[PDB]
Design a protein around this ligand. Structure first.
Ligand SMILES: Nc1ncnc2c1ncn2[C@@H]1O[C@H](COP(=O)(O)OP(=O)(O)O)[C@@H](O)[C@H]1O
Ligand SMILES: Nc1ncnc2c1ncn2[C@@H]1O[C@H](COP(=O)(O)OP(=O)(O)O)[C@@H](O)[C@H]1O
Ligand SMILES: [Mg+2]
Ligand SMILES: [Mg+2]
Length: 326
């Protein structure tokens, strides 16, 4: 009767052993600071859930970033704040410096340490083989940390990874979609961003875990080493699974949905087709051959697996021969 349950193979019961206050974010009380301490410089951009501004902390001449959340639900604002405070000081985790009430949109505003990022469209075309490995290892430190802390980032992608290349400093930012992992909990599948959505999301499998972030990381690695942005370029959430099945094959996809007793949307019957897993050498060309190695391909192979339980964990990934050179 319905899908088969699943649980993370690591850090399974971290949250149950911690005080209620750690994961029960709804009860958190915000200690509001003074908004007028930060002078807004310019709008960095607008997404569906926030407006981010470059700002100056006028007490110390330090550059900061101010994230002003769009209305949403009180529960979500406390969740991002709680996760940010629980992870504060962790390896390569962005530091929440302050919290203020915004006067224009009476919604709360998060103040962060500024990172001198470069648009990924430009930065990634300039990364060497060594650089990809170095930064991948830095992202893995953050993911292993947040997973060890019982938290799934759930939105791993280039716009959510700040890289100050000149100083070789990487921070994992945007904990807005992050959530506490509780074994057996059925989560909302409308998470991550299209090209980085795991097959568990695409097939509507709700009992997912930290391993979703490992699929997302794999998508980032494939785009970097093959110089193909994004690697799985779906037109929509249905075509997204089709793009994946053209690379990973359909037989392993059907075994995955068989294993978890998933009812695949009948809309896929006419579009998935029949595909065999491609050898990674198919995506290698003269212009990306310098970023590819047998270690890179093996590592990518171990992340990009339909079965979320079969993907390398962040700790296993950090042990991979791909990082022996770093
Ligand atoms: N600490 C930071 N330093 C520099 N730029 C940042 C920082 N935090 C966010 N940004 C920029 O603002 C954007 C939006 O921030 P983010 O937290 O991802 O918001 P959202 O949840 O709305 O996507 C980022 O993608 C990046 O371009
Ligand atoms: N990048 C995002 N940042 C914040 N909220 C998002 C983002 N993408 C989607 N959402 C919204 O949040 C929902 C998923 O959030 P979540 O808290 O996990 O689910 P639920 O509220 O059902 O428990 C989506 O259905 C959508 O409304
Ligand atoms: Mg973001
Ligand atoms: Mg976000």
């Amino acid at each position: 009767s319905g899908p088969v349950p699943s649980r993370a193979r690591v850090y399974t019961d971290v949250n149950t052993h911690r005080p209620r206050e750690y994961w029960d974010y709804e009860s958190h009380v915000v200690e509001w600071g003074n908004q007028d301490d930060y002078q807004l410089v310019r709008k960095l951009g607008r997404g569906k859930y926030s407006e981010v501004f470059e700002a100056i902390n006028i007490t110390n001449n330090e550059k900061v970033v101010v994230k002003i959340l769009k209305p949403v639900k009180k529960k979500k604002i406390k969740r991002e704040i709680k996760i940010l405070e629980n992870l504060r000081g962790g390896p390569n985790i962005i530091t929440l410096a302050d919290i203020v009430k915004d006067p224009v949109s009476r919604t709360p505003a998060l103040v962060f340490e500024h990172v001198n990022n470069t648009d990924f469209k430009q930065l990634y075309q300039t990364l060497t083989d060594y650089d990809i490995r170095f930064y991948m290892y830095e992202i893995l430190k953050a993911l292993d940390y947040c997973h060890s802390m019982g938290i799934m980032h759930r939105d791993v992608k280039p716009h959510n990874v700040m890289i100050d290349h000149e100083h070789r400093k990487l921070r994992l930012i945007d904990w807005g979609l992050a959530e506490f992992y509780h074994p057996g909990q059925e989560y909302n599948v409308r998470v991550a961003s299209r090209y980085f959505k795991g097959p568990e999301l695409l097939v509507d499998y709700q009992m997912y875990d930290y391993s979703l972030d490992m699929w997302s990381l794999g998508c980032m690695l494939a785009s970097m080493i093959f110089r193909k942005e994004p690697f799985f370029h779906g037109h929509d959430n249905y075509d997204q699974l089709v793009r994946i099945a053209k690379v990973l094959g359909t037989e392993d996809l059907y075994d995955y949905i068989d294993k978890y007793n998933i009812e695949l949307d009948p809309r896929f019957n006419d579009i998935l087709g029949r595909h065999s897993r491609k050898r990674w050498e198919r995506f290698v060309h003269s212009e990306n051959q310098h970023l590819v190695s047998p270690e890179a391909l093996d590592f990518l192979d171990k992340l990009l697996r339909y079965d979320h339980q079969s993907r390398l964990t962040a700790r296993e990934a950090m042990e991979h021969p791909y990082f022996y050179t770093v």
